[PDB]
Amino acid sequence: SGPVEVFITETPSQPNSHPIQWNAPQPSHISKYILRWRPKNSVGRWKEATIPGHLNSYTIKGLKPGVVYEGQLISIQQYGHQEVTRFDFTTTS
């Protein structure tokens, strides 16, 4: 439970790809992860994916190079509440 330990990782891949990694808390009160991301320019329409709870990393593909995204890793609980982790990351070429 609570905000996840998520970092701006970008291991050798494409600049259109962004392999983020997060590290979970110790209680198993968190089930799913949703990653959502919006290019931090406008605050308009944005994208999301749903990542399973066993996977602690995700590759956000189909992005633009050299742009800043604001990203949120929302962690849904066991049919209850949901927690929100907020950050920004950069994709760079």
CA distance 77 to 45: 25
Q: Which residue is listed with tokens 């990782």? A: 9
Q: Give the determination technique.
A: NMR
Structural domain boundaries, residue 45: 1-93
What number of other Cβ atoms are within 10 A of residue 53's Cβ? 13
Q: Which residues contact 48 (CB under 8 A, 6 or more apart)?
A: 34, 35, 36, 37
Sign of CA dihedral 19, 20, 26, 32: negative
What token pair was written down for 10? 């970008």
Count of structural domains, the chain: 1
Sign of CA dihedral 63, 66, 70, 73: positive
DSSP label at 19?
A: E
Domain of 67: which CATH number?
Answer: 2.60.40.10
- Cross-strand partners of 38: 70
What token pair was written down for 78? 């066991």
**CA–CA distances in Å: residue 79 to residues 29, 57, 71, 76, 82:** 10, 22, 23, 8, 9
What token pair was written down for 28? 């198993």
- Cross-strand partners of 51: 33
